[PDB]
Design an enzyme around this catalytic site. Structure first.
Site, PDB file in Angstrom:
ATOM      1  N   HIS B 459      13.290  -8.368   9.042  1.00 22.34           N
ATOM      2  CA  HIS B 459      12.646  -8.137   7.727  1.00 22.34           C
ATOM      3  C   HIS B 459      12.860  -6.704   7.311  1.00 22.34           C
ATOM      4  CE1 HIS B 459       9.681  -8.640   4.573  1.00 22.34           C
ATOM      5  NE2 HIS B 459       8.945  -7.593   5.013  1.00 22.34           N
TER       6      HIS B 459
HETATM    7  C1  LIG Z   1       7.738   3.439   6.864  1.00 25.43           C
HETATM    8  C2  LIG Z   1       7.679   2.155   7.648  1.00 25.43           C
HETATM    9  C3  LIG Z   1       8.743   1.283   7.575  1.00 25.43           C
HETATM   10  C4  LIG Z   1       8.759   0.063   8.262  1.00 25.43           C
HETATM   11  N1  LIG Z   1       9.832  -0.770   8.094  1.00 25.43           N
HETATM   12  C5  LIG Z   1       9.809  -1.925   8.727  1.00 25.43           C
HETATM   13  C6  LIG Z   1      10.884  -2.830   8.564  1.00 25.43           C
HETATM   14  O1  LIG Z   1      11.844  -2.620   7.818  1.00 25.43           O
HETATM   15  N2  LIG Z   1      10.811  -4.025   9.256  1.00 25.43           N
HETATM   16  C7  LIG Z   1       9.736  -4.328  10.070  1.00 25.43           C
HETATM   17  O2  LIG Z   1       9.712  -5.433  10.629  1.00 25.43           O
HETATM   18  N3  LIG Z   1       8.737  -3.473  10.250  1.00 25.43           N
HETATM   19  C8  LIG Z   1       8.743  -2.339   9.599  1.00 25.43           C
HETATM   20  N4  LIG Z   1       7.680  -1.472   9.759  1.00 25.43           N
HETATM   21  C9  LIG Z   1       6.557  -1.839  10.642  1.00 25.43           C
HETATM   22  C10 LIG Z   1       5.609  -2.783  10.011  1.00 25.43           C
HETATM   23  O3  LIG Z   1       5.096  -2.162   8.808  1.00 25.43           O
HETATM   24  C11 LIG Z   1       4.455  -3.116  10.957  1.00 25.43           C
HETATM   25  O4  LIG Z   1       4.958  -3.537  12.218  1.00 25.43           O
HETATM   26  C12 LIG Z   1       3.466  -4.157  10.423  1.00 25.43           C
HETATM   27  O5  LIG Z   1       2.972  -3.799   9.120  1.00 25.43           O
HETATM   28  C13 LIG Z   1       2.334  -4.371  11.408  1.00 25.43           C
HETATM   29  O6  LIG Z   1       1.535  -5.469  10.956  1.00 25.43           O
HETATM   30  P1  LIG Z   1       0.019  -5.555  11.457  1.00 25.43           P
HETATM   31  O7  LIG Z   1      -0.392  -6.928  11.042  1.00 25.43           O
HETATM   32  O8  LIG Z   1      -0.075  -5.054  12.863  1.00 25.43           O
HETATM   33  O9  LIG Z   1      -0.719  -4.507  10.515  1.00 25.43           O
HETATM   34  P2  LIG Z   1      -0.507  -3.923   9.033  1.00 25.43           P
HETATM   35  O10 LIG Z   1       0.494  -4.675   8.282  1.00 25.43           O
HETATM   36  O11 LIG Z   1      -0.351  -2.459   9.262  1.00 25.43           O
HETATM   37  O12 LIG Z   1      -1.958  -4.277   8.444  1.00 25.43           O
HETATM   38  C14 LIG Z   1      -3.077  -3.500   8.902  1.00 25.43           C
HETATM   39  C15 LIG Z   1      -4.083  -3.418   7.780  1.00 25.43           C
HETATM   40  O13 LIG Z   1      -5.395  -3.157   8.343  1.00 25.43           O
HETATM   41  C16 LIG Z   1      -6.109  -2.317   7.456  1.00 25.43           C
HETATM   42  N5  LIG Z   1      -7.163  -1.672   8.237  1.00 25.43           N
HETATM   43  C17 LIG Z   1      -7.013  -0.767   9.261  1.00 25.43           C
HETATM   44  N6  LIG Z   1      -8.155  -0.463   9.838  1.00 25.43           N
HETATM   45  C18 LIG Z   1      -9.108  -1.218   9.167  1.00 25.43           C
HETATM   46  C19 LIG Z   1     -10.507  -1.343   9.312  1.00 25.43           C
HETATM   47  N7  LIG Z   1     -11.208  -0.738  10.260  1.00 25.43           N
HETATM   48  N8  LIG Z   1     -11.135  -2.217   8.500  1.00 25.43           N
HETATM   49  C20 LIG Z   1     -10.421  -2.869   7.570  1.00 25.43           C
HETATM   50  N9  LIG Z   1      -9.102  -2.827   7.333  1.00 25.43           N
HETATM   51  C21 LIG Z   1      -8.503  -1.977   8.183  1.00 25.43           C
HETATM   52  C22 LIG Z   1      -5.072  -1.393   6.829  1.00 25.43           C
HETATM   53  O14 LIG Z   1      -5.548  -0.992   5.555  1.00 25.43           O
HETATM   54  C23 LIG Z   1      -3.832  -2.303   6.751  1.00 25.43           C
HETATM   55  O15 LIG Z   1      -3.703  -2.917   5.471  1.00 25.43           O
HETATM   56  C24 LIG Z   1       7.640  -0.272   9.053  1.00 25.43           C
HETATM   57  C25 LIG Z   1       6.577   0.650   9.150  1.00 25.43           C
HETATM   58  C26 LIG Z   1       6.561   1.825   8.422  1.00 25.43           C
HETATM   59  C27 LIG Z   1       5.353   2.732   8.492  1.00 25.43           C
HETATM   60  C1  LIG Z   2       9.839 -12.305  -3.608  1.00 27.49           C
HETATM   61  C2  LIG Z   2       8.813 -13.436  -3.516  1.00 27.49           C
HETATM   62  C3  LIG Z   2       9.033 -14.450  -4.636  1.00 27.49           C
HETATM   63  C4  LIG Z   2       8.801 -14.101  -2.145  1.00 27.49           C
HETATM   64  C5  LIG Z   2       7.616 -14.292  -1.441  1.00 27.49           C
HETATM   65  C6  LIG Z   2       7.610 -14.908  -0.198  1.00 27.49           C
HETATM   66  C7  LIG Z   2       8.789 -15.354   0.374  1.00 27.49           C
HETATM   67  C8  LIG Z   2       8.805 -15.990   1.743  1.00 27.49           C
HETATM   68  N1  LIG Z   2       9.463 -15.138   2.741  1.00 27.49           N
HETATM   69  C9  LIG Z   2       8.875 -13.793   2.733  1.00 27.49           C
HETATM   70  C10 LIG Z   2       9.545 -12.886   3.750  1.00 27.49           C
HETATM   71  C11 LIG Z   2       9.449 -13.475   5.140  1.00 27.49           C
HETATM   72  O1  LIG Z   2       8.088 -13.527   5.542  1.00 27.49           O
HETATM   73  C12 LIG Z   2      10.050 -14.865   5.124  1.00 27.49           C
HETATM   74  C13 LIG Z   2       9.380 -15.740   4.075  1.00 27.49           C
HETATM   75  C14 LIG Z   2       9.975 -15.150  -0.309  1.00 27.49           C
HETATM   76  C15 LIG Z   2       9.980 -14.544  -1.555  1.00 27.49           C
END
Ligand SMILES: Cc1cc2nc3c(=O)[nH]c(=O)nc-3n(C[C@H](O)[C@H](O)[C@H](O)COP(=O)(O)OP(=O)(O)OC[C@H]3O[C@@H](n4cnc5c(N)ncnc54)[C@H](O)[C@@H]3O)c2cc1C
Ligand SMILES: CC(C)c1ccc(CN2CCC(O)CC2)cc1
Ligand SMILES: Cc1cc2nc3c(=O)[nH]c(=O)nc-3n(C[C@H](O)[C@H](O)[C@H](O)COP(=O)(O)OP(=O)(O)OC[C@H]3O[C@@H](n4cnc5c(N)ncnc54)[C@H](O)[C@@H]3O)c2cc1C
Ligand SMILES: [Br-]
Ligand SMILES: [Mg+2]
Ligand SMILES: [Mg+2]
Lengths: 486, 483
Positions: B459
């Site tokens: 992704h």
């Molecule tokens: C700059 C950057 C680029 C990245 N690029 C990629 C990429 O290209 N491909 C990829 O696979 N991964 C990528 N990642 C990593 C990816 O973003 C994470 O692995 C992913 O978002 C983790 O999902 P999660 O469900 O652990 O938490 P998150 O998606 O981080 O969700 C956590 C949520 O919990 C909320 N939260 C935190 N503490 C609390 C609390 N106490 N109470 C309520 N809400 C709270 C936050 O507001 C946040 O919205 C990237 C990360 C960064 C920072």
């Molecule tokens: C742009 C928008 C219309 C949209 C939303 C959701 C999808 C589903 N897709 C999202 C990324 C991965 O989690 C694989 C599943 C595709 C397109």
């Protein structure tokens, strides 16, 4: 105030678990997050880190940056225009990115409002007790209670947060969070760190810098992108250098001070100095466990602060689970999603399933990009008595015409040479992230090298190189690199 | 001169067979072709159709054409430049392509010079007898003999040739062969046909056309790209239209005359007329068997003119074999190559091997492109009691910003719903040809939809759409479509 499942963090892992539990198994689900849309003050919001300040906006911004190369490369194909008129409008890019992210935020709002027994709560989630989550107005555990949620099952999915080294003048530095909202593109920028975030942002800033601009990436050790294929780490280094980025390896900021003009004076541990407009720290991300008050119920954390989990995402406390970056393993969105889908299929589906943390396809949106799945040869070589490495590397014909002759395409397949099983596949070049996905499926099915070489190529593609490799380039025998087998 | 193997046609398949037989099996090998480098008068040459007037140059030209979209799309990401300064210099494209093709011609010349036991003969190969290939000055069998080659084994690998309909003014039309050498980009062009060549050249000419230009594609049937997924046929039709190409379906040229200015006046069977600068016929490719004088040895043809073969590429005549387009099976370079390798393993290695023409990954370099592997759902529906279709279709986020909102990405997985076995995968969108390759490997391994869904996505990508589909969009039960 009573739910089958309460999810703290409306992010990649939390929303997959949330949505699946509600739609597939008719469960009643509460999801907590601190913000409903992207940006300051808390940056992550409804949709999570990836949506708000992660994969989604980063990829849009890397796509923007790629037009610097397309505009130049077009000339080899006969495209003519006034090169002196070309301007990169960073403010346009950030406005387009903000609208794209806001639309996703609104799409997830729609999701919650439309779906019966899937409720969003705004505020800071923490554990009162085994079966109660409290939502407070702030991260201060002394702030006002907004809600008190009774939970048969609790999911911790709060993700991670940038680490800022405790150096003098760290307050003059930003993280990736602030990089997404810079009002102007920096003329001079230091990206600190050797991982994917530093590398990807060095590319973005390189394309949008105003005239007389300079992107410097520094990394404390000898070679960027630890954990990637070595040939690729060296090649990315070259290809970033060829596109004007300065790579300072074995260098690390010791302090930063403000110059009188508001620019940053970086002093390295080596004594070197550098003036830049922006210092972006990208040295690591740390799990967000502090704010959950986990001491209240005794959830075990790791040496490093990640929630300890078993293979089924279970904490030491029954009914309490943890997925995604809070577990401090593979910090990737699709791993978080996979964990949440498995957890819900197990607990509410009664169909137990565990996330496989091996053979995970991933990418670096470097220019050009990396696509990888499974083991690098150094790791393979410590586990398997005989490892083969199949390697093809060349400048594609289109880049001999484009003038980007430095864009060497690298395709490496690593096998267990005893049975031919593919242990890993490592790609550098245009389309690598797209090529690698179905390679992840091949590795799940225990594909051998002969499954690749007996499949008919799609021509002309870069991908077909993976189906043309019949003969090892070299081997590891009991950990020892050699051209030829004994 | 005496050879273990004589190969007629130094093309995709002929060169794989000749090189394998010489190098892997130590055979004395002769290879015949009519030209040592690309272009007029015979167009194909050392390296074959794909090298000289096919996959290789067309892919460079489509890459060229794609810049028209990149330049426009860059604006959404904040790129600014003087749009009125923009020119598509076709002359530069053609010169760049000519050099790339000539370098390949030269590299094959060097391969023959440096590979002992592998010899190239220039001229027209035909069969004198079941163990004699004659090489003549020209395609006319009365032309001078340059060589008589004694052959234990003969491989026919002369490929295919464009089909020109016998209509009045056919002489005023060109094929893809001539399109590669047009000195100036046509302002107005009609591409005739609904196949990949017509669609790919429509996109090429659409990008390089001079100001006020217009590309029209005409096709006799109702919907372009028969053999491809029907959703993708419909979407590619819309996306070509959205980029300024006029798609004339249910239309076919009846005749062509020259206007007084030398432009082409096209009369369709419908009585519509179109004035264009070029008429490019892309209605079919026919096996090249005429010149081979196969009547000298009694090799069995089809009324079509292809060489009939068994699954091992053997003709009715012992020691005479045919591979690639001349067999009119699947006309793809990698298939020709696979057939050549399998033939040589079988005959010279005693390693019996037959090419699998099922589950072959292929592409259309339309803008945007197609990647596909295995059965379309209508074909699956006839062969399997229960067929499931998993479909994801949407404008990628980057094309909301680019302003190309018409660029709907399509991903479809067709299964045997009885066991989950993936029968076909069909993609439309940026990167589709690159995505589909490892899907080919998946289908060789009898991947099921569960194997796709349980794989972790990369992704953000288009490809990850293939690994997030849990639930069918619709079914076919006993040939009948059910939502
Ligand atoms: C700059 C950057 C680029 C990245 N690029 C990629 C990429 O290209 N491909 C990829 O696979 N991964 C990528 N990642 C990593 C990816 O973003 C994470 O692995 C992913 O978002 C983790 O999902 P999660 O469900 O652990 O938490 P998150 O998606 O981080 O969700 C956590 C949520 O919990 C909320 N939260 C935190 N503490 C609390 C609390 N106490 N109470 C309520 N809400 C709270 C936050 O507001 C946040 O919205 C990237 C990360 C960064 C920072
Ligand atoms: C742009 C928008 C219309 C949209 C939303 C959701 C999808 C589903 N897709 C999202 C990324 C991965 O989690 C694989 C599943 C595709 C397109
Ligand atoms: C415009 C176009 C685009 C294409 N794009 C693609 C694509 O992207 N991907 C793909 O996989 N396929 C593509 N193809 C198909 C591909 O080119 C063919 O399938 C492939 O070249 C056939 O290989 P072959 O060995 O059968 O014959 P060829 O490669 O055609 O070689 C036959 C050779 O025999 C020579 N010859 C003919 N008669 C004689 C004779 N009597 N004596 C001596 N020599 C003779 C010719 O000069 C020619 O070099 C394309 C075809 C065309 C026309
Ligand atoms: Br039709
Ligand atoms: Mg709701
Ligand atoms: Mg020789």
């Amino acid at each position: 105030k009573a739910f089958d499942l309460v999810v703290i963090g409306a992010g990649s892992g939390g929303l997959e678990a949330g949505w699946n539990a509600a739609t597939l198994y008719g469960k009643r689900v509460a999801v907590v997050d601190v913000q409903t849309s992207h940006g300051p003050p808390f940056y992550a919001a409804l949709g999570g880190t990836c949506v708000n300040v992660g994969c989604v906006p980063k990829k849009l911004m890397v796509t923007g940056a790629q037009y610097m190369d397309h505009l130049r490369e077009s000339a080899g194909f006969g495209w003519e225009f006034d090169g002196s008129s070309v301007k990169a409008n960073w403010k346009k890019l950030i406005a387009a990115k903000n609208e794209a992210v806001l639309d996703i935020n609104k799409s997830y709002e729609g999701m919650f409002n439309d779906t019966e027994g899937l409720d969003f709560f705004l505020g800071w989630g923490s554990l009162e007790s085994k079966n109660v989550v409290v939502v407070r107005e702030t991260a201060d555990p002394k702030s006002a209670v907004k809600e008190r949620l009774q939970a048969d099952h609790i999911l911790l999915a709060t993700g991670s947060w940038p680490q800022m080294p405790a150096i003098p003048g760290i307050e003059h530095c930003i993280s990736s969070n602030e990089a997404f909202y810079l009002p102007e593109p920096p003329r001079r920028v230091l990206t600190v760190g050797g991982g994917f975030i530093s590398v990807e942002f060095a590319g973005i800033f390189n394309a949008y810098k105003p005239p007389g601009g300079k992107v410097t990436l520094c990394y404390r050790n000898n070679l960027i992108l630890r954990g990637f294929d070595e040939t690729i780490r060296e090649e990315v280094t070259k290809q970033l250098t060829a596109n004007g980025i300065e790579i300072m390896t074995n260098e690390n900021p010791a302090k930063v001070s403000l110059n009188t003009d508001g620019s940053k004076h970086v002093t390295f541990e080596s004594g070197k100095t550098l003036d830049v407009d922006v210092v972006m720290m990208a040295i690591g991300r740390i799990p967000r466990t502090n704010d959950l008050q986990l001491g209240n119920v005794g959830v075990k954390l790791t040496p490093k602060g990640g929630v300890q989990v078993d293979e089924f995402s279970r904490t030491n406390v029954p009914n309490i689970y943890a997925i995604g970056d809070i577990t401090d393993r593979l910090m990737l969105t699709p791993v978080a999603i996979n964990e949440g889908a498995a957890l819900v299929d197990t607990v509410f589906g009664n169909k137990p399933r565990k996330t496989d943390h091996t053979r995970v396809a991933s990418a670096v949106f470097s220019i050009p990009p990396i696509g990888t799945c499974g083991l690098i040869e150094e790791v393979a070589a410590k586990e398997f008595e005989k490892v083969a490495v199949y390697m093809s590397s060349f400048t594609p014909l289109m880049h001999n015409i484009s003038g980007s002759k430095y864009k060497k395409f690298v395709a490496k397949i690593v096998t267990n040479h005893s049975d031919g099983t593919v242990l890993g596949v490592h790609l550098l070049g245009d389309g690598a992230p797209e090529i690698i996905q179905a390679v992840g499926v091949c590795l799940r099915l225990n594909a051998k090298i002969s499954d690749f070489y007996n499949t008919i190529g799609v021509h002309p593609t870069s991908a077909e190189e993976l189906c043309s490799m019949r003969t090892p380039s070299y081997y590891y025998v009991k950990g020892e690199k050699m051209e030829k087998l004994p």
